[PDB]
Write a protein that binds this ligand. Structure first.
Ligand SMILES: COc1ccc(CN2CCc3c(c(C(=O)NCc4cccc5ccccc45)nn3CCNC(C)(C)CO)C2)c2ccccc12
Ligand SMILES: [Cl-]
Ligand SMILES: [Cl-]
Ligand SMILES: [Cl-]
Ligand SMILES: [Cl-]
Length: 69
C-alpha cells in the first residue's frame, strides 16, 4: 504498495507512534527529540499530533510544525 498515504499505512504509523510514546524511557525524553524521531519514521505533522493526543500528552499542531521547521 500500500502506498504511504493510504489508511492502512497511516494507521500502522500512528499505532506504532503511540506504542513508542508510551515506553517509560520515551516518556522521559523531551518532546522535540520525539517529534524529530517520528518524522524519521515517516509520520506527517498531523499524524505526530494525533499520536501525542492519543497518549494524553497533547501538543498543538502549530507546536509540532514549529519543532519540525
Ligand atoms: C527519540 O527518542 C528515542 C528513539 C528511539 C528509542 C528506541 N526505542 C524505544 C522503544 C520503542 C521504539 C519503538 C519504535 O521505533 N517503533 C517503530 C516505530 C515507531 C514509530 C513510528 C513508526 C512508523 C513506522 C514504522 C515503525 C515505527 N517502539 N518502541 C516501543 C514499542 N516496542 C514494540 C515495537 C515492541 C511494541 O510494543 C524505539 C528511544 C529509547 C529511549 C528513549 C528515547 C528513544
Ligand atoms: Cl502505559
Ligand atoms: Cl514531558
Ligand atoms: Cl491508541
Ligand atoms: Cl502545545
Amino acid at each position: 504498495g500500500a502506498m504511504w498515504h493510504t489508511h492502512s499505512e497511516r494507521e500502522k504509523r500512528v499505532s506504532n507512534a503511540v506504542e513508542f510514546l508510551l515506553d517509560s524511557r520515551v516518556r522521559r525524553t523531551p518532546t522535540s527529540s520525539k517529534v524529530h524521531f517520528l518524522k524519521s519514521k515517516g509520520l506527517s505533522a498531523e499524524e505526530i499530533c494525533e499520536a501525542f493526543t492519543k497518549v494524553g500528552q497533547p501538543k498543538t499542531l502549530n507546536e509540532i510544525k514549529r519543532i519540525l521547521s
